[PDB]
Amino acid sequence: MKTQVAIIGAGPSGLLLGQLLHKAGIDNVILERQTPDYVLGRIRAGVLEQGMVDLLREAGVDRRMARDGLVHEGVEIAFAGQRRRIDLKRLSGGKTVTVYGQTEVTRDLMEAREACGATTVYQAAEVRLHDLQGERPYVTFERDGERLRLDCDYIAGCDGFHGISRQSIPAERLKVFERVYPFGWLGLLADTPPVSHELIFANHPRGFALCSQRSATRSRYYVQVPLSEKVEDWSDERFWTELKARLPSEVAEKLVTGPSLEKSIAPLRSFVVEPMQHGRLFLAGDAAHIVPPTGAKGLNLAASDVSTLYRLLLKAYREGRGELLERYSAICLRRIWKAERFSWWMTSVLHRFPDTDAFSQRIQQTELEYYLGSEAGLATIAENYVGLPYEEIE
Amino acid sequence: MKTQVAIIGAGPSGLLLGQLLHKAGIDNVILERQTPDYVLGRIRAGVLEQGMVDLLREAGVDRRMARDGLVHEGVEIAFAGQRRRIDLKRLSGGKTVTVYGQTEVTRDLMEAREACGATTVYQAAEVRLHDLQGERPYVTFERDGERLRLDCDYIAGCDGFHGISRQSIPAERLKVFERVYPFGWLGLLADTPPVSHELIFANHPRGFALCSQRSATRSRYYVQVPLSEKVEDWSDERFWTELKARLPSEVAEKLVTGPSLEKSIAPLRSFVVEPMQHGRLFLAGDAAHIVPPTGAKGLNLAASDVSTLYRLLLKAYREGRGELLERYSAICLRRIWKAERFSWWMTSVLHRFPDTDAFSQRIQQTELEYYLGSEAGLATIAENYVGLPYEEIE
Numbered sequence: 025m026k027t028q029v030a031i032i033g034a035g036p037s038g039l040l041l042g043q044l045l046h047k048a049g050i051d052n053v054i055l056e057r058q059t060p061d062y063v064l065g066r067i068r069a070g071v072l073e074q075g076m077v078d079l080l081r082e083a084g085v086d087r088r089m090a091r092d093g094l095v096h097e098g099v100e101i102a103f104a105g106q107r108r109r110i111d112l113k114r115l116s117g118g119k120t121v122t123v124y125g126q127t128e129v130t131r132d133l134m135e136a137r138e139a140c141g142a143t144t145v146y147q148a149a150e151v152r153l154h155d156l157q158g159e160r161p162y163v164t165f166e167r168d169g170e171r172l173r174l175d176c177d178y179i180a181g182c183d184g185f186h187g188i189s190r191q192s193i194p195a196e197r198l199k200v201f202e203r204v205y206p207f208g209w210l211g212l213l214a215d216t217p218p219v220s221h222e223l224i225f226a227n228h229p230r231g232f233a234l235c236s237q238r239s240a241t242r243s244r245y246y247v248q249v250p251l252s253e254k255v256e257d258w259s260d261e262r263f264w265t266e267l268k269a270r271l272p273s274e275v276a277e278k279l280v281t282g283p284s285l286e287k288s289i290a291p292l293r294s295f296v297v298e299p300m301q302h303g304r305l306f307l308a309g310d311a312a313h314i315v316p317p318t319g320a321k322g323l324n325l326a327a328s329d330v331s332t333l334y335r336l337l338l339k340a341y342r343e344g345r346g347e348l349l350e351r352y353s354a355i356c357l358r359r360i361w362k363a364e365r366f367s368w369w370m371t372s373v374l375h376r377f378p379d380t381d382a383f384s385q386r387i388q389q390t391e392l393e394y395y396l397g398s399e400a401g402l403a404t405i406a407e408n409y410v411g412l413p414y415e416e417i418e
Numbered sequence: 419m420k421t422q423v424a425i426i427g428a429g430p431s432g433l434l435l436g437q438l439l440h441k442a443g444i445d446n447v448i449l450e451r452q453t454p455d456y457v458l459g460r461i462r463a464g465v466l467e468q469g470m471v472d473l474l475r476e477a478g479v480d481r482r483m484a485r486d487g488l489v490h491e492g493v494e495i496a497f498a499g500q501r502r503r504i505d506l507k508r509l510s511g512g513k514t515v516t517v518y519g520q521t522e523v524t525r526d527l528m529e530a531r532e533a534c535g536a537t538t539v540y541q542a543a544e545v546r547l548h549d550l551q552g553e554r555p556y557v558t559f560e561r562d563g564e565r566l567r568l569d570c571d572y573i574a575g576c577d578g579f580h581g582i583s584r585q586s587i588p589a590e591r592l593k594v595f596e597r598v599y600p601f602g603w604l605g606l607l608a609d610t611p612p613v614s615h616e617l618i619f620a621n622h623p624r625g626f627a628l629c630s631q632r633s634a635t636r637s638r639y640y641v642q643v644p645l646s647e648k649v650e651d652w653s654d655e656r657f658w659t660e661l662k663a664r665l666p667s668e669v670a671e672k673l674v675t676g677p678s679l680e681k682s683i684a685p686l687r688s689f690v691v692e693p694m695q696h697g698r699l700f701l702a703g704d705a706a707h708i709v710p711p712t713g714a715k716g717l718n719l720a721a722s723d724v725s726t727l728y729r730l731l732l733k734a735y736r737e738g739r740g741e742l743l744e745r746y747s748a749i750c751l752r753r754i755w756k757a758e759r760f761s762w763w764m765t766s767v768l769h770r771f772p773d774t775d776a777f778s779q780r781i782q783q784t785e786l787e788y789y790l791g792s793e794a795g796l797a798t799i800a801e802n803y804v805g806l807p808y809e810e811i812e
């Protein structure tokens with residue numbers, strides 16, 4: 025079996041890299057462990073950078089997103105009874121963000137890949153990677169019990185945190201940087217109209233809460249919960265009582281509550297590997313780095329990794345400039361580390377930590393009062409929240 | 419013995435509060451434990467906010483400062499071989515800072531208080547404070563062995579971290595917020611021309627260094643040193659070898675070294691008490707709060723405390739509006755906490771910490787790369803370094 029770029033994973037990273045490449049004429053096969061339904065059941069992301077909106081347009085897959093996606097021009101931060109709105113458009117020089125769920129982006133690309141006839145093997149069990157420093161790397165896997173071989177020029181590991189491709193690099197060639205946080209996010213999806221037309225991130229003594237949305241009639245909410253927590257200890261009513269308690273009263277009062285469609289606990293983690301490549305293997309998205317959800321940067325970082333792997337494989341095939349692929353990691357990590365710092369900063373100023381002495385509680389309150397009350401403070405949150413520019417390539 | 423405002427301490431806080439008050443006709447006595455020479459031997463501060471320059475002018479004591487002080491329009495930060503200049507004037511909207519040592523300010527006010535004939539008792543031993551919630555507070559002390567009583571309307575504790583007046587408040591009425599840092603600053607004063615016309619704060623693997631100045635021919639330098647350290651383990655040559663090692667080569671090369679006039683180790687500490695007053699006692703400067711030297715804010719915070727205690731005792735005497743003194747702490751702490759956060763931030767991004775995992779080292783490098791490479795990042799350092807505005811009073 026033979027292809028030009030083999031892609032491990034049909035989550036948003038693999039599907040969008042696969043789409044862009046097909047449209048430029050560069051053949052590619054996607055391998056996925058799970059069924060299409062398993063992949064589409066994941067709720068994940070809601071906020072999308074303008075940079076990601078332009079890439080879906082470049083890939084020809086924006087009909088529904090331009091239709092149904094919501095453009096947002098501001099977000100709110102609430103702490104100490106105050107609600108302070110950051111006008112993102114005014115403060116970033118006109119950039120805005122787009123709310124469109126991750127299930128929906130993945131569905132659109134799954135549909136778009138099928139129409140155009142590109143190759144996708146779901147239920148590919150036991151994927152293994154071989155001969156990474158050769159000229160002919162290959163991938164082995166099992167489909168319904170029989171072991172097949174796929175031959176390629178290059179491999180793109182787009183398989184998330186627990187994928188096989190970071191594990192397939194000699195660990196001595198990698199440096200891992202990680203922080204695990206002492207809490208998670210209990211998220212709840214409800215078919216109810218949202219409490220506001222923009223998002224409200226909130227700092228509260230009991231811990232963090234988030235008001236987010238999927239459309240005019242579907243909502244996504246999160247509360248901070250300690251790592252001890254089991255999702256079956258949280259009834260829908262237990263969760264709504266607790267969300268109402270962490271919010272400003274004039275906002276908890278008009279909240280339309282309702283039963284969940286989905287309820288899950290996501291642990292928080294910062295994680296980076298350097299370099300993001302080995303021989304003919306290039307890592308993208310969560311295969312290479314994790315951010316805490318607080319900056320809404322994870323999927324937007326997959327997109328820039330993919331936008332950078334695509335433009336370098338294009339120069340490599342169309343222009344024969346195959347040497348430029350050694351720059352993939354140096355270009356991606358400049359962007360990745362600045363988003364890791366924004367995501368860490370948002371996480372330490374909006375959440376409640378364990379054994380936080382009186383002084384750190386007060387510096388945390390003062391970070392929020394300074395960045396929110398200063399034009400220069402407001403602009404650093406804002407240019408980072410809409411998303412810092414994408415690097416030029418050559 | 420009787421006065422209107424009794425002042426404990428003749429360091430810059432007490433002397434400047436005392437000066438301002440005299441000139442408005444409000445009598446005051448200063449009490450000091452030490453001799454004039456002991457007070458003038460302390461080197462301390464070098465950087466002065468515009469806000470402090472206007473106050474010394476208001477107090478009629480700026481002849482030498484306008485003559486000899488250096489106005490600076492920028493500072494440098496060095497990390498990872500890079501030197502990045504912050505243009506303070508451009509980024510704060512024209513505010514600048516003034517370099518003029520603390521010894522010099524104190525000498526000018528000591529001279530100015532003597533000329534005008536105002537009362538100062540040096541070598542006042544064992545100062546005690548009495549009847550703080552009364553209408554007639556009094557101060558007791560010993561001059562050459564005999565115990566005298568001074569009667570006043572109000573008491574201003576301007577006696578630094580180890581003074582008697584914070585100790586004279588019932589501890590249950592106070593909340594202390596403190597962080598002790600795991601290192602100090604070894605400072606060295608030399609009669610040599612400085613290495614640059616502006617200050618260079620530097621982050622280095624070996625730890626922190628600072629290039630500062632007193633005039634065209636006197637210099638002040640600091641290196642980070644662990645708390646274990648004894649100043650007699652640091653010969654002048656040991657110190658110059660180590661300072662040269664923490665700097666960029668093109669800067670260590672043109673450094674003019676020379677023997678010290680003064681060499682001392684100052685420990686680093688953040689400290690705040692709330693409230694800053696009790697009955698007829700009002701705390702000012704280091705009596706109430708400590709910042710790490712990294713933001714050059716300590717003496718500039720004493721000045722705003724004094725500018726706020728003066729304008730409220732003026733309304734209390736001239737205008738009979740004695741009730742406004744209950745606002746002293748609420749007005750001072752808004753400014754104090756934003757400067758405590760800037761001083762803490764500068765401290766955590768320029769110093770080397772113990773048992774710093776790989777991830778925090780990398781976020782520290784990325785804080786410096788983001789705040790230094792962004793117009794909005796540069797403006798938040800800059801408006802905070804020249805000094806946030808002083809609050810209106812009524």
Ligand SMILES: Cc1cc2nc3c(=O)[nH]c(=O)nc-3n(C[C@H](O)[C@H](O)[C@H](O)COP(=O)(O)OP(=O)(O)OC[C@H]3O[C@@H](n4cnc5c(N)ncnc54)[C@H](O)[C@@H]3O)c2cc1C
Nearest residue numbers: 033035037068069070071183184309310320321322323324
């Ligand atoms: C609570 C939560 C909220 C978030 N909110 C946001 C937000 O608003 N904005 C934002 O930008 N980010 C957010 N994110 C992050 C975002 O969802 C991820 O960064 C994103 O899914 C990355 O996509 P990916 O394709 O790299 O990885 P994934 O989505 O993990 O896709 C990887 C795919 O590879 C497959 N795979 C794994 N192992 C193998 C194997 N051995 N062989 C074959 N296939 C394999 C998996 O089955 C999966 O289908 C959020 C995440 C969470 C959990």
Ligand SMILES: Cc1cc2nc3c(=O)[nH]c(=O)nc-3n(C[C@H](O)[C@H](O)[C@H](O)COP(=O)(O)OP(=O)(O)OC[C@H]3O[C@@H](n4cnc5c(N)ncnc54)[C@H](O)[C@@H]3O)c2cc1C
Nearest residue numbers: 427429431462463464465577578703704714715716717718
């Ligand atoms: C390394 C170093 C560098 C610094 N660099 C800067 C900088 O550039 N910029 C800046 O803004 N700040 C800086 N500071 C801080 C600054 O020097 C202090 O914040 C400042 O001295 C405050 O003045 P004060 O009058 O409140 O206190 P002090 O200067 O401590 O004066 C208090 C006086 O009260 C006396 N006193 C104490 N107990 C009694 C008693 N019981 N009875 C009577 N009198 C008593 C003491 O003897 C002393 O004379 C620096 C400090 C250090 C150590």
